[PDB]
Each structure stands twice: as C-alpha cells, then as structure tokens.
Design an enzyme around this catalytic site. Structure first.
Site, short mmCIF file in Angstrom:
data_model
loop_
_atom_site.label_atom_id
_atom_site.label_comp_id
_atom_site.label_asym_id
_atom_site.label_seq_id
_atom_site.Cartn_x
_atom_site.Cartn_y
_atom_site.Cartn_z
N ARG A 66 0.90 -1.05 0.05
CA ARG A 66 -0.25 -0.23 0.31
C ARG A 66 0.79 1.04 -0.14
O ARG A 66 1.11 1.84 1.12
CB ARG A 66 -1.06 0.21 1.09
CG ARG A 66 -2.50 1.22 1.24
CD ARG A 66 -2.63 1.69 2.14
NE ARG A 66 -1.65 3.04 2.16
CZ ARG A 66 -0.53 3.36 3.19
NH1 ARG A 66 -0.95 2.58 5.00
NH2 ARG A 66 -0.10 4.14 3.13
N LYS B 230 12.50 7.08 2.88
CA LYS B 230 12.16 7.95 4.33
C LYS B 230 13.41 7.98 5.01
O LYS B 230 13.89 8.58 6.15
CB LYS B 230 10.96 6.66 4.71
CG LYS B 230 11.01 6.71 6.49
CD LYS B 230 9.68 8.29 6.23
CE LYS B 230 8.63 7.82 7.12
NZ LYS B 230 7.12 8.78 6.75
N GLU C 168 6.03 0.52 7.18
CA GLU C 168 5.92 1.60 6.13
C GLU C 168 4.99 1.21 5.09
O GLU C 168 5.40 -0.24 4.02
CB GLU C 168 6.74 2.47 5.59
CG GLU C 168 6.60 3.61 5.17
CD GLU C 168 6.68 4.78 4.95
OE1 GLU C 168 6.60 5.63 4.56
OE2 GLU C 168 6.08 4.85 6.69
N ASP C 169 3.68 1.73 4.44
CA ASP C 169 3.17 1.30 3.60
C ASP C 169 2.19 -0.48 3.36
O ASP C 169 2.71 -0.90 2.69
CB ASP C 169 3.58 1.94 2.39
CG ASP C 169 3.77 3.34 2.14
OD1 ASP C 169 3.11 3.88 2.56
OD2 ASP C 169 4.71 4.04 1.60
N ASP D 209 4.59 5.14 11.32
CA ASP D 209 4.92 6.21 10.65
C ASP D 209 3.17 6.76 10.23
O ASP D 209 2.31 7.95 10.70
CB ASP D 209 6.17 6.25 9.89
CG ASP D 209 5.91 8.12 9.46
OD1 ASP D 209 6.01 8.89 10.64
OD2 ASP D 209 5.40 8.55 8.62
N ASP D 210 2.48 5.33 9.34
CA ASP D 210 1.54 6.27 8.60
C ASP D 210 0.23 6.38 9.83
O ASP D 210 -0.84 7.08 10.06
CB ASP D 210 1.17 5.02 7.49
CG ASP D 210 1.98 4.59 6.72
OD1 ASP D 210 3.22 5.95 6.59
OD2 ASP D 210 1.89 3.36 6.12
N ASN E 163 -3.53 13.12 1.48
CA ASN E 163 -2.56 13.61 -0.18
C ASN E 163 -3.07 12.40 -1.31
O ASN E 163 -3.56 11.94 -1.57
CB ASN E 163 -1.06 13.01 0.44
CG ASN E 163 -1.18 13.49 1.83
OD1 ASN E 163 -1.05 14.93 1.31
ND2 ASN E 163 -0.96 12.65 2.88
#
Lengths: 531, 531
Positions: free
Chosen positions: A140, A158, A230-231, A253-254, A388
């Site tokens: 993702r 990152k 992340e993601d 972090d998300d 975003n």
C-alpha cells in the site's frame, strides 16, 4: 587512493584538498579545480534546475547519494525544496518505475523464499551497526496501492529524511523490503519486474515470516534497534503494530506519526482559539488508519488535561464510507447513540463540530456548504485537510479561506501556496508533514536506548512541536513551525524524549549524560567532510 | 561481496546467478529476479527511449559504464544507434557542459603545473597495463573550438569506440586530457569550471611539457603503447604528429584516420566508375588538416599503382579560404602553374574534376551550379561532403542526388537518410566515419607490437575497407560497408596489419602466431561476463 574515490561515505570529489590528493595518491584522477562544499552545492543545484522533471531530479540526487553521501545530505539540508523530490510525492513515481529505472541497489531485499534463513540474508549487509530500519512489503504505497518489490524506493527515501531532518547516521540505517509477492497484474506481466513473480502469500505463512524478521533483526542488531513499518495494507498495519510494539522498538509512521502531527496541529490551534481541548467537538472524515490513531491520541491529551476516558471519547465522532459511526471493533469505541446518517453536509449540521479533520483520501469532501456551515457554528473553525496528494485533499486553502471569510484555521497534508485575503493579510497554511515527527522521535529513542515507543512519546512529541510555533507564525496562519526549521524541531523533540527517559529510568544508555542537549547533538550527523 | 558490486569490471547486477550471489555473499543486496544479459539490455534500451534528449541518453550510458562495463559495451555493440550518443555529435554537447555535469571522473588529468612530475601523475592510475591512450589538450573540439579541460569527454568517448568497434580491453585504455589553460572566456569566468583558470601556455614551455608526456607514457607503459592525438589545433596537430610518429607509436585520427576513410571511399567509387585512380582529377574544398592528409594518401595510392610522385601530385588540386592554390609549405607541394581564382563554381568549371571532396567546414559549398557542372563533365561524378556536423556539409544527399539526376556517387561525414529517386530505386549514402579506421588500426598495431604507424598501414587499411564493400552495396549507393558490420571490418583491418607485420618482420610480439585471424580474435574484448 582510487578506492576511496569509490567509497561514498568518504569521497569528496573536487573538495579533496590539493594536499589530500597528493597524500592519498589521487592527484590526476580529478581535474585541477578545488571546490568548497558550497561550490559543490551550487553545481548540483544548477543541474537540479536545468532538468525537465522532478523524476529526473530524483534520479540526479539518488545518483549523488550513491557517489558522495556528505554532499547528498548537504544539498538536502540546504529541505522544503528537496524533500518532495527524495520522498513523497516524487518517490511514488520512482516506485512505479523502479523496475524500468533500477540502477545501483540500496537496501536489503528479503523474500519469503528466505524463510528460515533470514539471519543469513542480513549478513550480506556490509554495515555492522544498524540503529534504524524502515521496512515495507510494498502493498500500500501512498495512493498507488500494491507495487510489490518496487516498493524499495519508499524505505530508501524515508531514511534519507531520518538522516537529513534528524541526523541519523546514514551508515546506521537499513532500508528493507519484504517481498512476499504482489497482486499487481501489470508487474506480474512485466518481463522487467525485479520482484517475485507470484501473488502475495497471505495468512499464517506471512505472519511467521514477519515474526522471523523481527527476531532476526533484534538478534543481529540488538533489541534497541528501531524498526519502522511503512506502507503495509490497513489490516496488517494494525495487526503487526499491536503485536510487536511492546516487544520490539517499533512504530508505524502512517498511523502513529500522522497522529502526532495532527494533534500538534490541534494543540497549536487552541492558542488561536484560546480555549481548552475539552471545549472541542471533533469530527473525522475517515475512520481508518490515521483517523483512529489521531483520535486515540486526542483522547490521551484529554486525559492529561484531566478528563476521564468515558467523558473524553464522547467528544469525538468518526465518519466512514458507509456513513457516520453510531451505536448500531476499534471503530466500536467511538460508536455513540445517534440516528444513523450518510451525507457529510448533513452530518456537520447535526453534530456542529469545532474541528473538522479529513483523513479519508476523498478530494473535495469539504464542500462550500460544509465550510459555510463550519464558519457559521464557529468564530474560528479548525479545518484539517490531511489527505494526500493535493488532488485528494478535502479542500484547497484558497477555498477554505475564501469560503470562511479568512476565519478558518487551516492545515493540510500536502503543501499549498500562501493565500492573500481581501484584507491584504497573507496566510501561510501549514503542512501536516509526518517529517515533523519521525526524525526527532527516532533520534531521541535511539539516543537514550528506549526499548518500546509508547503513545506517550507521540503525545509529548505533539506538545513539543506546538510549543515551537511562534505567536508571529500563528498570526500568519501557520499551525506548524516553518519547514526550514525541522532540524531544530527534531532536536527539540529528541531532547524532550531523552530528558524524560532518564527522569523516568526508561533510558537504557548509561552512564547518564550531564547535558542532554549536547548529548543529542553528539548523536547527530554532520554534513561536514570528516578530516 | 558488496565490493564486487562496486567494481564495474566484474559487477553483473541482476545477471549475478542465484548460486554466485550465495557464494559471494550478496544474496539480499539485489532483488530476487535473475536477468540474462538480453533482459538487461532490454531494460537499458527502454530507458534510453523514454528519455527526452540524446544528452540525457549520453548521461544514462555513461553512468552505466561507471557501474557495469560488460553491460555498457553489450548495449553499444547491440552501434549505429549508440555511437552518435557516446561519441560525436552528442559528446560535443557533453564537453560544452562537462563542468556543469561533472560526476564520476574517468581518465587522467595532467596539468602544466605537473611539468617535471608527470611520471608520478600516471602512478595515480589504478590500471597497470595500458596499451592505448587517447589524448587532447581540448583546444579544438569538433566545431566548438576551445573547451579546455572540459575536453575530457572526447578521449573517454573515443576509447569507448576502440573497445566497442575494435575490442580493445577497456581496462587497457587510458583517456587523458592535458590542461595547459584555455582561451575560452566563458569558462575562465565560470565559477564551476574544473580546469586551470588561466590562458593557454604557448611556445617552448608547451612543447617541453608534451615531450615529457610522451617520455613518461612510453616509459611507464612501454614504447609499444599506442598514443592517439585528438582535437588539438591545426598547427600543433601537424607539429606534434611529425615530431613524434617515428619515435613513438602514435597517430592523429583527425588527419590520418580521415585520410584512410576518404581514400577507402574513393577506392570503393572506382568499382562503380570502372576506371583507375590515375584517370581521376581530384579537387578539394579545403586545404587544412584533413585535405592535406587525404591528398598525401591519394598520392601514395597512385605511386602504388605505378605513377611517379611528380606525375601523381599533378592529378590533385586544393582550394583554401583565400582561393585556389597555384604557383604564386605543405600547401606548396600542390601549387601548380595556373591563373589564380576564388569562386568555387568557376574553379570547378576550369578544372572539371572527376571527384570533388569537401573538408572545409563550410556548409552548402557544393551548390546546385557545382553539382550541375560535376554531373555535366562526368557520367558519374564522385562527390564527398565530409564536413561535420550535418549543418556544415557541402550539400545534402537529397540535393546531391536530385541535382545530378541520381548519377552522383556520394558519401558524407555525417549520416544522411536513404534517398528514394523518381526511378523508384533507393540510394543509401554512406558515412565517411573515422570509426571504420581507428579501431581496427589500433587493434592490429597493438596486437603485433608495431612501434611506429606508417602511412602505409593507413593506405592498406583503406584498401581493406573498400574490399569489404559488396557489389550489392555499391548498387545501393554505399561506398562503405554497413555500419552494423564494423566489428568485422575492424577485425579484417587488424588481420591485414598483423599478417603484413610478420611477413615484413615489423612485428615485435613473438613468437609468431600460426593463425593470425585467431590471434587477432584472442586480443578482442568480449561482451560476455567472465565466469
């Protein structure tokens, strides 16, 4: 000699002094000019400009990282301009294209086919002290979804910001991609695809794979090693976070970063509104990762000011795709008794919130009617469009400020240009950028050896960020410190984390430093060439 | 492991086999895909295409050279497309921009400030057997003039073609720039200029500097080491050539290479015209470097067929800027008794030549009237527009073939598209490319250890190139073998040089090979990854 030239940690290109060249046997490998770091930057910047697309600028700066790291990080710190290039949004385009454009690999590729042998894959990595890892399975990526093993662009970008905004030693950073397959049809079709040409492994096999990863990492690098996710897709992101965050030193972090900035934004806004967090009624567009994270952290902030959880939770409402959340899992915790509704415009009318926060990636959601209404119930409505990129934002700064007659207090996830009002006063809407948070947290945590990263350190991080917004800035409409200052913000964040960790005996790095500010500086990377 | 990855001679990127990765401890430094060299090329080529300018393609391929040499040379040999990118014309734009764009230095920078210590500057170069050097002082780069120390792009591009067309080991090639200053005002002004910020040293100081260079090179690398000059100004180019070519193993491609192709073109043309070189009358537009070189070599060819020099020289006329050369230095040798004239159109009328060769860089010089006249005196006029780039050509293929009603036998220095005539027959004008010559000469010379490179080996090289043009090709209007075949042409050239050198005891590599063709192959670089 020539070998030094090929080592990116120690190569200075034309900054090699005329003596150094003679002592290191490279006089002749370089043209005659000597260049200070400042002339070096000028060159890189000129190039940067003459190029046709940001994608090409990404490629320029990445090649530069692979050849002269000090200069790479020097260029970046010289951030508002370059962070969008090296990370989001441009790094999305890079991931999309990672298989076309693949050149000099950075990071570690760890595959399910390595299950049982992960520990040995880590031994291929040339660097022996790693204090910070960023990992993804590529499922993702921002709004581009499943890009599989192309996802490597994400950890690499990152960590670049960990070093640039925070001062993490880049030699102690390890970008990692976990390749368990991809559901991306195009990639599975693409002869150039660099990943495993198979669909994603799901279930128990997947979970054990991840378990072996954390075990391998903590084991080779120590349990103090910071592991940032992340993601990942939504469901894995919570599953893995909650499974690991009391055992490993780790955050996502998300959900957690995003929670920290947004709250910092809110705290900052209360100085303009001149009332308490307990006087707010908060409405979320969205009920996913971010939304729930922020809410959880707002609740903590409410407890801290004196409310009990029951009274605190009642101050927050959420909205998902199927409509408002009401009595009829983690969502269930905010399910208040109320008639069900679907229309956002109607929802804001009945609830009449003081703050409206968009984290559902549906652009335009904050319509003229909604802004009209928010400006009616509130003298100064708080309106966060944090989704975003710009295209998916709940509304523009221009629309926000126009429709609220300049009275809205506004921040967004993606940057908008300053707005001049009929007033003549120019407003500078701030950007809810996760990079106000993660670099300083990582630095603090790693510096004093925190073994687990609690929600409290995200709360106090939000507090530090708000404390850094000047009254001048607030008058200019900024709810965050100017993006040019993040190096200092990060340092403030890390100072606080360290001071508290020693005061709470949560630190594990002993002996205790007598001066925590200096202690933090001592752990920050310099842009200067080592002598 | 990781070090191998950073060595461009041995790195395979994704072509590293799954076993190799495990044996060399790099499993994890690369994504999971394995790629044959052919899939690797496909990637590079796709990139190559998606890019916006040839300048960006130059940059792509140069970065690739700096990271995976085998693949670099594989991509190039997969030449008609890529030679214009890596060398002329695009390499001119690269030199113009070398100071903006300077990244990973290749080659040796040797400055006048190293006078007295050149030998030690060579010791900085990591490679210990060098068989081929290309050098420039950057004073006369194609038509862009004095680009000083930016001139380094030129030797680097040139050696790329030595390896790609000829099979020179790129690890045994040494690009060199001599920086003695520059007269370029812009560069001396430019804070980014990488060279010496001073005007060119001239005279005796310059000459001794060059003397020390040749002495240093021959001494460290042996007198067999091939030293090719390139893009010096006219007067230095002859001075240095004639001073050195009986003492060192050395040539100037701009005068001698050019002489070889052009003559090859002429020899090829005689098969269409079906008459002898002695039946020609040759008129040159231009009387400089190239012009004099070609003429000298035509004379030798005439001697070889049986004419004495006196009778032979009378067959050739030259034209300089101030007009036709007639009785009233090296020019003086062709100064025949004739009324002086200036107008080119009038000159071709009185002289009525069989072949017209333009090497003065004045574009359009071969006007409709001149082509009209050439087609009148001759059933099949030979017309060479060898000046570069296309813009400075004496006439287009289309204009040439149109105006001569398809009867002209035409070649040019810069490539033109095939022309279809009213006839329906398509003509494919050949390109007088110096790269038909230099790679094969260098290979031959170095292979058998020739210590001096005589005009005869340039003559026989022209003969070999013409011998390779098929009667099919001649009927298609090609005076040179298809550019796709240069690898074989080069090999033919080098076979001939070697066979003759052993037959003439001029070779110095002993023992003599029993099979010269195989012997030459043995000295050719492979695009294949070493096991």
């Amino acid at each position: 000699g020539y070998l030094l030239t090929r080592n990116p940690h120690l190569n200075k290109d034309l900054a090699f002094t005329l003596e150094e060249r003679q002592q290191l046997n490279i006089h002749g490998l370089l043209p005659p000019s000597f260049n200070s770091q400042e002339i070096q930057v000028l060159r890189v910047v000129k190039n940067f400009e003459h190029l046709n697309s940001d994608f090409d600028r990404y490629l320029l700066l990445m090649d530069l990282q692979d050849r002269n790291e000090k200069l790479f990080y020097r260029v970046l710190t010289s951030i508002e301009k370059f962070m969008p290039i090296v990370y989001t949004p441009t790094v999305g385009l890079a991931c999309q294209q990672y298989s076309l454009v693949f050149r000099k690999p950075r990071g570690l590729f760890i595959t399910i086919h390595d299950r049982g042998h992960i520990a040995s894959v880590l031994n291929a990595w040339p660097e022996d002290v790693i204090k910070a890892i960023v990992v993804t399975d590529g499922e993702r990526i921002l709004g581009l979804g499943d890009l599989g093993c192309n996802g490597m662009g994400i950890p690499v970008g990152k960590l670049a910001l960990y070093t640039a905004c925070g001062g993490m030693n880049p030699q102690e950073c390890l970008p990692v991609i976990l390749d368990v397959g991809t559901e991306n049809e195009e990639l599975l079709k693409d002869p150039l695809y660099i990943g495993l040409r198979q669909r994603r492994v799901r279930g128990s096999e997947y979970d054990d794979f991840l378990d072996e990863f954390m075990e391998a990492v903590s084991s080779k690098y120590g349990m103090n090693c910071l592991i940032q996710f992340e993601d990942f897709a939504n469901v894995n992101a919570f599953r893995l976070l909650n499974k690991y965050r009391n055992q490993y030193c780790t955050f996502n972090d998300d959900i957690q970063g995003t929670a920290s900035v947004a709250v910092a934004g809110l705290l900052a806004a209360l100085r303009i509104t001149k009332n308490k967090l307990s006087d707010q009624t908060i409405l979320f567009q969205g009920a996913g990762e971010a939304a729930l994270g922020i809410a959880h952290l707002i609740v903590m902030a409410l407890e801290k000011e004196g409310l009990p959880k029951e009274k605190a939770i009642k101050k927050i409402w959420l909205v998902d795709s199927k409509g408002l959340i009401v009595k009829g899992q983690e969502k269930e915790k905010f399910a208040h008794e109320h008639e069900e509704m679907k229309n956002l415009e109607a929802i804001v009318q009945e609830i009449k919130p003081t703050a409206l926060i968009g984290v559902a990636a549906i652009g335009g959601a904050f319509s003229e009617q909604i802004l009209k209404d928010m400006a009616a119930f509130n003298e100064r409505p708080i309106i966060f469009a944090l989704s975003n990129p710009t295209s998916k934002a709940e509304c523009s700064a221009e629309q926000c400020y126009k429709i609220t007659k300049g009275r809205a207090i506004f921040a967004s996830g993606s940057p908008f240009d300053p707005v001049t009002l009929p007033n003549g006063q120019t407003l500078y809407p701030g950007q809810g950028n996760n990079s106000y948070v993660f670099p300083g947290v990582a630095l603090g945590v790693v510096a004093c050896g925190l073994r687990q990263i609690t929600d409290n350190i995200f709360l106090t991080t939000a507090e530090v960020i708000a404390q850094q917004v000047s009254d001048k800035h607030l008058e200019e409409g900024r709810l965050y410190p100017p993006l040019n200052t993040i190096r200092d913000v990060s340092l403030k964040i890390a100072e606080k984390i360290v001071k508290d960790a020693y005061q709470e005996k949560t630190a594990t790095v002993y002996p205790e430093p007598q001066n925590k500010e200096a202690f933090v500086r001592s752990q920050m990377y310099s842009t200067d060439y080592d002598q």
